[PDB]
């Protein structure tokens, strides 16, 4: 299968035609996506198979072939880019200044950008091109707009 670093679409042929259910990041031989995209199922990459290695429903994250490798964090001040990969459309970078999710367990960066559900798992980057989290787990606020957390895992 293809193990080149980069952003990938996660597809399924179970429904009508070929449907994009999400997106993920290949880095250091490990595939990273959100748990709600795959529900922890195995994935295919050409003729090869990717088996889950770690996952957590509460963080809404899952890694395949190895442990979670992404450890960069939003600095709390700078603009970032969502490398959005929408269903049936080309990868596109969108720059934005994150807002904040304030929780009883601390603050998390959040991006106020609205893309289809199939874009979940698209990476959010800093100015060095490092992945600071994945887009796709968030909330719908008063005016009906979507705000995603910047969801990042822990590198053991």
């Amino acid at each position: 299968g293809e193990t080149t670093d980069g952003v990938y679409r996660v597809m399924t042929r179970r429904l009508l035609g070929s449907t994009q259910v999400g997106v993920g990041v290949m880095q250091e031989g490990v595939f990273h996506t959100m748990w709600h995209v795959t529900k922890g199922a195995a994935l295919r990459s050409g003729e090869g198979r990717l088996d889950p290695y770690w996952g957590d429903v509460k963080q809404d994250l899952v890694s395949y072939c190895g442990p979670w490798k992404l450890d960069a964090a939003w600095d709390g001040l700078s603009e970032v880019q969502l490398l959005a990969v929408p269903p049936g459309e080309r990868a596109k970078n969108i720059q934005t200044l994150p807002g904040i999710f304030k929780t009883k367990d601390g603050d998390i960066g959040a991006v106020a950008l609205d893309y289809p559900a199939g874009t979940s798992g698209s990476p959010i980057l800093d100015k060095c091109g490092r992945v600071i989290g994945l887009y796709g787990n968030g909330v719908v606020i008063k005016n009906g707009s979507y705000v995603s957390a910047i969801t990042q895992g822990k590198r053991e």
């Binding site: 679409r9 597809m11 295919r44 429903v57 509460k58 904040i100 091109g129 705000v147």
Partner: protein, 39 residues
């Protein structure tokens, strides 16, 4: 059966389209991984 297909490189694009606001929200995270608004 789920499969993956390469979509691109991960790089910062100089002069990308700049949009979106920066809301400061009070939220709660439940055991199922769902975020909700705290009012």
């Amino acid at each position: 059966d789920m499969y993956i297909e390469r979509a691109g490189d991960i790089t910062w694009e100089k002069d990308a389209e700049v949009t979106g606001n920066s809301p400061r929200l009070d939220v709660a995270l439940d055991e199922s991984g769902d975020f909700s608004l705290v009012e």
